[PDB]
Amino acid sequence: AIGQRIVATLPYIKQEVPIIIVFRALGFVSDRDILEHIIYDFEDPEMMEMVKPSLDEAF
Amino acid sequence: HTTLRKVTANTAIYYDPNPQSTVVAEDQEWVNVYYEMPDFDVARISPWLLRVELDRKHMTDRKLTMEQIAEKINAGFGDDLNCIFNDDNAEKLVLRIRIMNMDDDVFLRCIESNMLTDMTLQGIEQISKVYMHLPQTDNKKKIIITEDGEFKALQEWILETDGVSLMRVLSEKDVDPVRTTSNDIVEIFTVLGIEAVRKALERELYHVISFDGSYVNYRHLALLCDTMTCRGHLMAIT
Amino acid sequence: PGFVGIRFCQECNNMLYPKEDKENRILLYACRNCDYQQEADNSCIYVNKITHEVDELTQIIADVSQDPTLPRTEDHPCQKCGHKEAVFFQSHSARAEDAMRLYYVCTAPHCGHRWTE
Amino acid sequence: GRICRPLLIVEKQKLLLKKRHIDQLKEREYNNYSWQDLVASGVVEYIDTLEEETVMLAMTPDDLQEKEVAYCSTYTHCEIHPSMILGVCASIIPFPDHNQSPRNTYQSAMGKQAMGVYITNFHV
Amino acid sequence: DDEEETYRLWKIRKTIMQLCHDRGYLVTQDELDQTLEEFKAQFGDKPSEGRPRRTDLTVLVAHNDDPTDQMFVFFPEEPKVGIKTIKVYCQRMQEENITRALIVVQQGMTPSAKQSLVDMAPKYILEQFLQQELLINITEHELVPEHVVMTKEEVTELLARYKLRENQLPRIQAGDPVARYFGIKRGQVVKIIRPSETAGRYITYRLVQ
Amino acid sequence: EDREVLRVIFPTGDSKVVLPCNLLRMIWNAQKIFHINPRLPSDLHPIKVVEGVKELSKKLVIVNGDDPLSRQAQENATLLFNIHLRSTLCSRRMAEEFRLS
Amino acid sequence: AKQDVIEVIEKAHNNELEPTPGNTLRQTFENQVNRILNDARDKTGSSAQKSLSEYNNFKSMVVSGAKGSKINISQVIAVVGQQNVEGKRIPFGFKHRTLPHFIKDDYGPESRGFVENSYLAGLTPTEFFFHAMGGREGLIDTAVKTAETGYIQRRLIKSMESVMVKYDATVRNSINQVVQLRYGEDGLAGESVEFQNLATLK
Ligand SMILES: [Zn+2]
Ligand SMILES: [Zn+2]
Predict the structure, then answer these.
(1) Phi-psi map region of E50: left, alpha, beta (phi>0 left; psi -120 to 50 alpha)
(2) Which residue, of A7, D17, E88, E178, is most buried by count of CB atoms within 10 Å of its CB?
(3) Which residues does chain F have within 8 Å of residue E159's beta carbon, measured at their own beta carbons?
(4) Statement to judge: residues C57 and C102 lie in one domain
(5) In the CATH scheme, what is the code of domain B1-131?
(6) Cα separation of C4 and F85, whole Å?
(7) How far is F16 from chain G (nearest CA, A)?
């Protein structure tokens, strides 16, 4: 809608799933933990704003 | 076609609670030069500001000015979206928007993402790029008949677009509505009709056949083109 | 202007979203999971660099000087260490049209200075 | 499933394949010094398609010579011979680098319909 | 904002006069080639404020063959013309005893208005035109050949000469741009004269559908 | 008049056309068959050229019929060829260029 | 020519190259390099062509038009030239390289597929591979165009198969609808017509 959303087409599932939902389903609920796993350099706001829509879509 | 993104350098949303003391230091001159007289409803002001920075190169490449841009914004969104701007003299071409009266900041972000795509500053939609050039070949030059009776090929500027709006481009000042054409036969049929698309389709098939130096008798092209147009519509060979 | 980074709550470690306090007429960063709030210090909430004026020297890493497949030159000495040899390469990055520009890196170990002519 | 090929490793600007290896290879049938001893000596290496991206090849040891203007000067491997880029049927074409390439493809297809003796024990 | 508006109005009027002249309506040469400055003198150069209003641009021509066979050209003010406006124009045509009209809309026309234009055809043959498609006369395009509406006597002579039925001629849609320019309905035949690189000239005949 | 008709048919000055009879080759054939001497005065009356070309044009029929519609279609079918014929079999060209008998 | 391409490369590397209207800087650099190398190929081909004697059998067959062309002579004697894949120079199929034998970011003529040898001289291994790539493009084109062109042929035939010249000289389809009142607008067959000149036009 507002920005570019990241989705994940898992096997045996016929609907796209947000990546943040998959991360939480694996036990990583805090957004900090998820971006620790995704973004390894926190000095880089470009990656951050490009992942932000996915977080905003899964709250 | 030129959208606000094509001429924009960078956009940003600030939280400016009072325009008198702006967040940025270099925009304090023209903002106060604008605010010392009440031009709009200062009470109907929102603290969320949307500052866009233009670039002189793209502004000059289109002979565009902040006046036209601000007029286009105030027309597309009326008075609900206030816009202000400085003169075309500062080292940075900057103009500041606010919303007049979902939360406000999200609304500013949404209209930012929309204006940067749909706000047509200049040009005709669906026409991406245009190239002006002199045709060295006589097939695109302007062939006239001199007063002495000789054929003379005038070397004139012609434009080649990357999209087609024949309907609009024809109805433009200083555009030839007689020789201006297109290679999209469907638009020729929609704009000029069945005999126009018959002739244009003959021209395009001839161009495809002859580009490799080949030659086909014209009656074969004419028969194919009559087959595709004898029933009043464009009959595809399918 | 510069970009704006994401900031997280101090309790739930979720991202702080922007919010406005009418009472003080001031920007706040608040969590929509917990009930934490913070006084912003930048006042800028969003930044889009449409021009994409990115300094690709920041994207380069000195380790690239160890690449045997990169070209080396002795004509551009290093301004930081004075080493003669240096590897050079083009941007090869999308969203960069004028990408014939050359970026140089010093091959001296532990110097790793990067520059552009 | 990773397709790879053997290549000669290169020192600073020299091959590791010294003349002693060629000497031991010449008497291959006496001292049982084979290809595997060449690989075990660290003189030859199998490089796959994905590791070739990180490799700087010399087409011949002549490329390792110091030149008036050095092209690379930091090679890591060398071709055993460039003609090994061809397959079985293209390796029968004489002077394939003096033909138009479609001709070499048509021969590579037509060497397979050529008559000969397809196998020695054809009588049985 | 305003000079271009009057320019568009003048161009639309020029195309309309050319159209009426090609349909056979009595159009003086003076208005047939009216300069933009003359248009400003006769109507004004400030349409935005109300000089000229589009209601002042209304044209009323008479056929050369029949002075009683007149035709209107209306220029509605609203961009999207509604059924009420169509009823008003039909009322005016009834009062003035005129049976043909052109409506030069700006943005478009509502579905109910179009259905009204279609249902009452046997009473009033009133057509719909976009101002966008009247800013150019398409008949002047190089691709468009010379179209000529044949008379029923000419059509009968044609079918008797070539000994064929109307369904055997090639066709032209009733909604064709040139068919709409010439205001021709189903059952009419249009003679197209175009130059031919093999014969010099070629006449073909298309039946309207 | 034929010149102006050609000028509106071929708005670009391209005289290359595809037509039935190669009139220059037929004229050359006639020159060689009858041993025409290009240096001597000819015995061909220019009025004979005009009349003969007109009768020829009448004999070349693509559309048959005396009715006006068939007359106009016949005019159109052979227009370009008849222009080529009148400009090639002209009385002046037949008198000082081809010098036929 | 190779020094000219080196000069253009040095200009591009120093940002001393400005783009031309209608193209990006990459495309302008590619245009300049391709123009230089095409000029080199044409000049060398002209040199080879002028070197030929009247007894040359390539020249004999080209002159008669029996077989071959001047470009074939140029490729056999002078230079094979630039190999193109999809109308562009050899792509960087490796990481910023055309082959592992080149340095990264090498837009020179030999790196990107310019065969500076003739067929008599013989191609070098990289020239051999790039030439094989260019020839593979032609083989693919020849083998892939056939289905589409044949489908187009069948479609055209089935669309026009029953259109015929009738005894009233009109061209009509099976429905008896009139497609042309006279064939080719002139009622003439295409075997007997031929090229001529209108003497009163120009
Ligand atoms: Zn929180
Ligand atoms: Zn250094």
Answers:
(1) left
(2) E178
(3) none
(4) yes
(5) 3.30.1360.140
(6) 83
(7) 5
10 Å CB burial of residue B226 (0-12, 13-18, 19+) is buried
> Rounded to whole angstroms, how far apart are CA atoms B111 and B80?
12
Backbone angles phi, psi at E174, to 5 degrees: -65, -30
Same domain? C29 vs C84: no
Under 8 Å between Cβ of E82 and E75: no
F15-26 exposure pattern, b = at least 16 Cβ within 10 A, e = fewer:
eebbbbbebeee
Contact with chain F for residue G152, Cβ under 8 A: no
Question: Residue E133 and residue E131: Cα distance in Å, rounded?
Answer: 5
Confirm if E200 and F9 have CB atoms less than 8 A apart.
Answer: yes
Structure tokens at A49: 């704003």
Find the CB nearest E161 among F67, F79, F83. F67
Inspect the interface and report whether the beta carbons of E168 and G186 lie closer than 8 Å: no
Q: What sign has the CA pseudo-torsion D79, D82, D86, D92?
A: negative
Query: Obtained via which technique?
Result: cryo-EM
- Amino acid letter for position E203: I
Shared-domain flag, residues C14 and C30:
yes
Enter the resolution in angstroms. 2.8
CA-based nearest residue to B54, from B122, B116, B118: B116
E107: its two tokens: 């943005």
Residues C53 and C43 in one domain: no
Q: Is B60 on the interface with E (CB under 8 A)?
A: no
Mark whether C62 and C102 lie in a shared domain. yes
Answer yes or no: are the C-beta atoms of C47 and B12 closer than 8 Å. yes
Q: Are residues C38 and C80 in the same domain?
A: no
Prior bond of G109 cis (ω within 30°): no
| Number of other CB atoms surrounding residue G201 within 10 Å | 21
By the CB < 8 Å criterion, does A59 face chain B? no
- Asked whether at least 3 C-beta pairs link F and C within 8 Å, the reply is no
Rounded to whole angstroms, how far apart are CA atoms A34 and A53?
A: 14
* Range(s) of the domain holding residue C27: 1-48
C-alpha span between B153 and B144 (Å, rounded):
6
**Between residues 138 and 197 of chain B, which touch chain E (CB distance below 8 Å)?**
167-168, 170-171, 173, 177-179, 181, 188, 190-197
What is the rounded end-to-end Cα distance, in angstroms, of chain F? Answer: 28
In a shared domain, residues C109 and C69: yes
Q: Is G178 on the interface with D (CB under 8 A)?
A: no
N- to C-terminal Cα separation, chain A: 15
The total number of structural domains that make up chain C: 2
